[PDB]
RNA sequence: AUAAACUAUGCCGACUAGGGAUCGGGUGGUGUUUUUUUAAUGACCCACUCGGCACCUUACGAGAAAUCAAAGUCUU
C-alpha cells in the first residue's frame, strides 16, 4: 500500500511487495494488527550478498519512520519472522536517522544535538540489525597499515537468528557505513 | 528534585529517553506520557527559579559558614569557605555569561544572604 | 595544554624507544592532518581507529625509520626569504628535508606548499 | 612571619620502568574464621585484578659530573 509509506509517491518492486506484505500480516495475524496499524515506512533498500560461490543470495533492509520506532521494536521479533517467510529474503529494520553536518552549521541559534551525529548514527545500525538481541562487547582494532576492524561480541543464546543474517549485516554495513564488521560469539 | 529527578532510575528507569529514545531498552513504559506521567509529579512539585547546580553550591556553602561565623577559630574552615566560595562564584560566570540575569544571582546577595524561598 | 608536540612528541617520544606506535591526544583535524602529511610522504604507518568523547578518530601504528621525532615548533612565519631559511631546521639540504608548514591554503609540507607559491604559518617539520 | 621556610632539581601539558615496597576497587580464590543443630555471611589469609598510595630501582634519555626513570628530553 502507498498507505504504509511517507513519501507516498511511487514504490519500487521491492518497496511495493513490502507494502502489501505488511498490510497482509495485519489482516492475517490478529496480534500484529495493533503494532502494524502504527508502523509506517520511510524507504526500503535491497542489497545483494555476493559470495565467491557465484551464488546470488539477497536480502532487504527497511527504514521504519522514527515515529514508529518504539512500536517497531515492540514486536520486532515476530515481524521479521513473517516478513522473511512471506518474502523469502533476509529482513532488517532500521530507524530513519538524519545526520547533521559538522562544519556546515547555518542556524546561528541552533546547536547540533549529538543524537544525530555521524559517529552515533552509523553506530546505530549495528544495534538495529542484530536487532532481536543487542551485543555484549564491541571493539576496534588497528591493523598496521591503518584499517579498523570491528569485532563485535554477540550473545550465545541468540546464535539462531543472528548466525544467518551475520553475512548480510557485514555486507550492508560495509555499504552504508564503510566499516568491516566481523562478529564473534561468546 | 532534578538532580534526583532520576531516583526514578531506582524504580522505573532508565536514564532516560523515553525523553528521546536512542540506545533504548526493554520493559513496559507508556512513552513520553509514561515519563511526564509521574516524572512531572517528581519533586512533589516543580522548579526553575535558578539554578540547582548553584542552588546547592550556595547552600552547602551558606550553612557552610554558620560554623565559620560562630566557631571563627576553625581557620581550617575558612580555608574551604574560600573554596566552596570561589566555586559558588566560578559557576555564576557561565550564566553571568548565559542563564542568570546579568548582575544579581550572577552576583546575588552572595556573601551574603541565605536565599530565598 | 597543547595538542601538537603533545602527540608528535609521543611518536617522536616513541620510535626512539622503537616499537609499533601507540595512542595520542584526542584527534584534532590538525593532529590527524600532520599524522597525514607524514604517512603521505612515508615515515609513519597507518593512522588509526578510535572514537570517544573527543578521544575519537585514531591511534596510529609506527613502522619505518621516521627518525627522529616529528617537529613541533611554536612560532609561525613563512614565504620566500622565509621558508627557505627555516629550512635550516632541516636535517640537511640534499633532499631529506620536509617542513610540514601551515600555508595560508592547506596544512602542507616544505614543498607540498612550496607548491603553488604558498606560505604562512610553520606548523612543524618531519625527519 | 624571621627561619639551619630545601629532594641544593619547577612546572599549565608526561614518557624511557620496571622490580619491589605500601592504600583503594574487582577477581579468583584456594587458606583460615565467623555464623554459629552445618554454612552462606563476616572476618583473617591466599592469589589475581584492575584504583590510584607512595616510595624505592635503572637492560633508557640526560648533563658540563655526582645523579636522574628527571635536570631524560627538538647537530648542544
Domain ranges of chain C: 1-66, 67-127
Least CA distance to A148: which residue of chain C?
C49
With beta carbons less than 8 A apart as the criterion, state whether A161 and A133 touch: yes
Does one domain contain both B4 and B52?
Answer: no
Q: Is B55 in the same domain as B106?
A: yes
Residue C29 is classified by DSSP as H
Q: Are residues B52 and B41 in the same domain?
A: no
Same domain, B30 and B53: no
- Does the nearest atom of strand D lie within 7 Å of C87's Cβ? no
Q: Counting every residue, how long is chain B? A: 117
B12 in the same domain as B61: no
Kindly determine whether residue C46 and residue A145, on different chains, have CB atoms separated by under 8 Å. yes
Report the structure determination method.
Answer: cryo-EM
Q: Which residue has the cell 546575588?
A: B108
Asked if residues B56 and B25 have their Cβ atoms less than 8 Å apart, the reply is no
Tell me, yes or no, whether B66 and B83 share the same domain: yes
d(CA A74, CA A82): 15
The CA–C1' separation of C7 and D36, in angstroms, is 61
The distance of C86 to chain A (nearest Cα, Å) reads 32
Bases along strand D below 7 A from a protein CB: 12-17, 60-61, 74
Tell me which residue of C24, C15, C96 sits closest to C60, measured CA to CA: C24
CB < 8 Å to B21, chain A: 69-70
Please answer yes or no on whether A73 and B20 come within 8 Å at the CB atom.
no
Please give, rounded to a whole number of angstroms, the shortest distance from the CA of C46 to a CA of chain A: 4
**In terms of domains, do B6 and B52 share one?**
no
Shortest CA–C1' contact from C68: which nucleotide? D74
CATH architecture of the domain formed by C1-66: 2-Layer Sandwich (3.30)
Q: Which of B21, B47, B19 is nearest to B35 (CA)?
A: B19
Whole-number Å distance between alpha carbons of A150 and B43: 44
- Give CA–CA dist A48/C121, Å, rounded: 50
Same domain, B34 and B83: no
Query: Which residues of chain C (21-80) touch nucleic strand D at CB < 7 A?
Result: 69, 71-72
Is the Cβ atom of C13 within 7 Å of strand D at any atom? yes
Same domain, B25 and B43: yes
Same domain, B87 and B60: yes
Total tally of structural domains belonging to chain B: 2
Q: Do B21 and A127 touch (CB under 8 A)?
A: no
**Nearest Cα to B1, choosing from B59, B37, B54, B52?**
B52
Which of B16, B17, B18, B22 is the best residue to mutate to test the A interface, defined by the most A CB atoms within 10 Å of its own CB? B22
Domain with B3 in it: 1-47
Angle formed at CA C73 by CA C42 and CA C121, multiple of 5 degrees? 85
Residue C124 cell numbers, joined: 612543524
Separation of alpha carbons A153 and A148, rounded Å: 16
Cell numbers given for B47:
522548579
- Contact at 8 Å (CB) between A152 and A170? no
**A102 at interface of C, judged by CB pairs closer than 8 A:** no
Let me know whether B70 and B41 are in one domain: no
Alpha-carbon distances, residue A135 vs A128, A139, A171 (angstroms): 10, 11, 18
Q: Distance (Å, rounded) from C-alpha B1 to C-alpha A163?
A: 46
Determine, for residues A144 and C45 on separate chains, whether the beta-carbon distance falls below 8 Å.
yes
Q: Across the A/B interface, how many CB contacts are shorter than 8 Å?
A: 10
- Chain B contact present for A117, CB below 8 A: no
**Residue B9 has which C-alpha cell?**
532510575
Q: Which of A69, A70, A127 sits opposite B23 (nearest CB)?
A: A127
CA neighbor of B88 nearest in space, from B67, B66, B117, B112: B112
Q: Does A115 touch chain B (CB under 8 A)?
A: yes
Class of domain C67-127: alpha beta
SS3 content of chain B, % helix, strand, coil (to 5): 40, 0, 55
Local structure of residue A63 (DSSP, 8 states)? E
Provide the resolution (angstroms). 7.3
Neighbours of A7 (CB within 10 A): 11
Say if residue B54 is in the same domain as residue B43: no
Amino acid at each position: 500500500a502507498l498507505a504504509k509509506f511517507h513519501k507516498k509517491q511511487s514504490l519500487t518492486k521491492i518497496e511495493e511487495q513490502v507494502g502489501s506484505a505488511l498490510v497482509e500480516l495485519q489482516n492475517t495475524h490478529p496480534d500484529l494488527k495493533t503494532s502494524l496499524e502504527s508502523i509506517i515506512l520511510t524507504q526500503v533498500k535491497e542489497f545483494q550478498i555476493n559470495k565467491t560461490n557465484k551464488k546470488a543470495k539477497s536480502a532487504v533492509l527497511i527504514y521504519v519512520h522514527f515515529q514508529s520506532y518504539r512500536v517497531l521494536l515492540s514486536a520486532a521479533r515476530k515481524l521479521i519472522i513473517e516478513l522473511e517467510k512471506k518474502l523469502k529474503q533476509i529482513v532488517f529494520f532500521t530507524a530513519q536517522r538524519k545526520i547533521e553536518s559538522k562544519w556546515v552549521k547555518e542556524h546561528k541559534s541552533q546547536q547540533r544535538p549529538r543524537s544525530r551525529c555521524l559517529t552515533y548514527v552509523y553506530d546505530a545500525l549495528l544495534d538495529d540489525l542484530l536487532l532481536p538481541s543487542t551485543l555484549i562487547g564491541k571493539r576496534i582494532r588497528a591493523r598496521l597499515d591503518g584499517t579498523s576492524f570491528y569485532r563485535i561480541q554477540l550473545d550465545q543464546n541468540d546464535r539462531d537468528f543472528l548466525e544467518e543474517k551475520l553475512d548480510a549485516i557485514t555486507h550492508i554495513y560495509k555499504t552504508v557505513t564503510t566499516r568491516e564488521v566481523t562478529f564473534e560469539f561468546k | 528534585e532534578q538532580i534526583v529527578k532520576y531516583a526514578r532510575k531506582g524504580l522505573t528507569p532508565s536514564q532516560i529517553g523515553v525523553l528521546l529514545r536512542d540506545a533504548h531498552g526493554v520493559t513496559q513504559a507508556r512513552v513520553i506520557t509514561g515519563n511526564k506521567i509521574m516524572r512531572i509529579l517528581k519533586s512533589n512539585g516543580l522548579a526553575p527559579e535558578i539554578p540547582e547546580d548553584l542552588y546547592y553550591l550556595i547552600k552547602k556553602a551558606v550553612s557552610v559558614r554558620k560554623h565559620l561565623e560562630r566557631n571563627r577559630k576553625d581557620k581550617d574552615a575558612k580555608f574551604r569557605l574560600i573554596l566552596i566560595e570561589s566555586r559558588i562564584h566560578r559557576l555564576a560566570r557561565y550564566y553571568r555569561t548565559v542563564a542568570v540575569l546579568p548582575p544579581n544571582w550572577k552576583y546575588e546577595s552572595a556573601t551574603a544572604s541565605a536565599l530565598v524561598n | 595544554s597543547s595538542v601538537l608536540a603533545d602527540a608528535l612528541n609521543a611518536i617522536n617520544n616513541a620510535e626512539k624507544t622503537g616499537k609499533r606506535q601507540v595512542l595520542i591526544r584526542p584527534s584534532s583535524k590538525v593532529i590527524i592532518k600532520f599524522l597525514q602529511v607524514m604517512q603521505k610522504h612515508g615515515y609513519i604507518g597507518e593512522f588509526e581507529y578510535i572514537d570517544d568523547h573527543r578521544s575519537g578518530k585514531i591511534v596510529v601504528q609506527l613502522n619505518g625509520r621516521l627518525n627522529k621525532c616529528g617537529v613541533i615548533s611554536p612560532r609561525f612565519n613563512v614565504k620566500i626569504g622565509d621558508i627557505e631559511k627555516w629550512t635550516a631546521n632541516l636535517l640537511p639540504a640534499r633532499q631529506f628535508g620536509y617542513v610540514i608548514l601551515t600555508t595560508s591554503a592547506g596544512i602542507m609540507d616544505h614543498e607540498e606548499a612550496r607548491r603553488k607559491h604558498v606560505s604562512g604559518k610553520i606548523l612543524g617539520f618531519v625527519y
